[PDB]
Design a protein around this ligand. Structure first.
Ligand SMILES: CS(=O)(=O)c1ccc(Nc2cc(Cl)nc3ccnn23)cc1
Length: 292
């Protein structure tokens, strides 16, 4: 740790405090995460992430393990998608910039998923932006290393808002499709300026999903009634049209979102396929003017 001096607090993340810090030797400015005190499988798991390098994944620079505490050192970015969404509230993010962010995050997912690494906890707070019009996913692979707790070290409630229905229904093994579901939620959120499914307990989360997308049944999702927390007594809601959910998103956009929000994870579009969707035929890379 003595190689770093703490510049400021920039978050109470899932596992510990996140600091902007400076490398007292090499001068570099980095994001420094302290991990809630570690077992050997986690060290091996984290270490494999050092190799998982992509322009849309926040680079893991180092892992520091002393007095049985754990520190991850990351590439620093100045701003997350929530702040930027708040900043953009009066007009919303321009659609060309939403499309470019979606397109880059998809490339990031397609890379990690090709290597069988999933995120499991995408949310606007771990989607970080720079002044060059780039966006990057923070904390990829950490939920498998450390688990995803109900509360953070600070007792902050972990959001359910972006959690896929299979996880909420008690599936033991979930796939890369859980990441596509969350990105789809965040897509809808950029377009509407409101969270799609802002649930405030597990059953409120499912019920909000069900209200918008129809209660899932053996027709839309073969095998669902056999899932661990599925109950035959769930209220039976009818699906709404996506024209009602995400105006004024266009037809290609609504088509893409639909396939990212399929109930059956086997049927939900992959990141790779998503990148080929007609929604991206006219994609570009705008710069946001950012206030840092
Ligand atoms: C509110 S914010 O937009 O001011 C802000 C500022 C800085 C950061 N940076 C950041 C925060 C976290 Cl948690 N992890 C990492 C990793 C690389 N940068 N970084 C995030 C959000």
């Amino acid at each position: 740790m003595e190689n770093f001096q703490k510049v400021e607090k920039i978050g109470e993340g899932t596992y510990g405090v996140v600091y902007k810090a400076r490398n007292k030797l090499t001068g570099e400015v980095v994001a420094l995460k302290k991990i809630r005190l570690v077992p050997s499988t986690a060290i091996r798991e984290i270490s494999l992430l050092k190799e998982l390098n992509h322009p849309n994944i926040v680079k893991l620079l180092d892992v520091i393990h002393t007095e049985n505490k754990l520190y991850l050192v990351f590439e620093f970015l100045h701003q997350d998608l929530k702040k930027f969404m708040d900043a953009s509230a009066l007009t919303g993010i321009p659609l060309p910039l939403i499309k470019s962010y979606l397109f880059q995050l998809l490339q990031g997912l397609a890379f990690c998923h090709s290597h069988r690494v999933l995120h499991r906890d995408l949310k606007p707070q771990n989607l970080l932006i720079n002044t060059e019009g780039a966006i990057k996913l923070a904390d990829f692979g950490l939920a498998r290393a450390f688990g995803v707790p109900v509360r953070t070290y600070t007792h902050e409630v972990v959001t359910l808002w972006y959690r896929a229905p299979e996880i909420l229904l008690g599936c033991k093994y979930y796939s890369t499709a859980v990441d596509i579901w969350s990105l789809g939620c965040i897509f809808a959120e950029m377009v509407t300026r409101r969270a799609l499914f802002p649930g405030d307990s597990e059953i409120d989360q499912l019920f909000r999903i069900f209200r918008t997308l129809g209660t899932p049944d053996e027709v839309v999702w073969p095998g669902v009634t056999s899932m661990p927390d599925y109950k035959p007594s769930f209220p039976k809601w009818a699906r709404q049209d996506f024209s009602k959910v995400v105006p004024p998103l266009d037809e290609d956009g609504r088509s893409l979102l639909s396939q990212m929000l399929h109930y059956d994870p086997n049927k939900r579009i992959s990141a790779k396929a998503a990148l080929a969707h007609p929604f991206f035929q006219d994609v570009t890379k705008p710069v946001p003017h950012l206030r840092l």
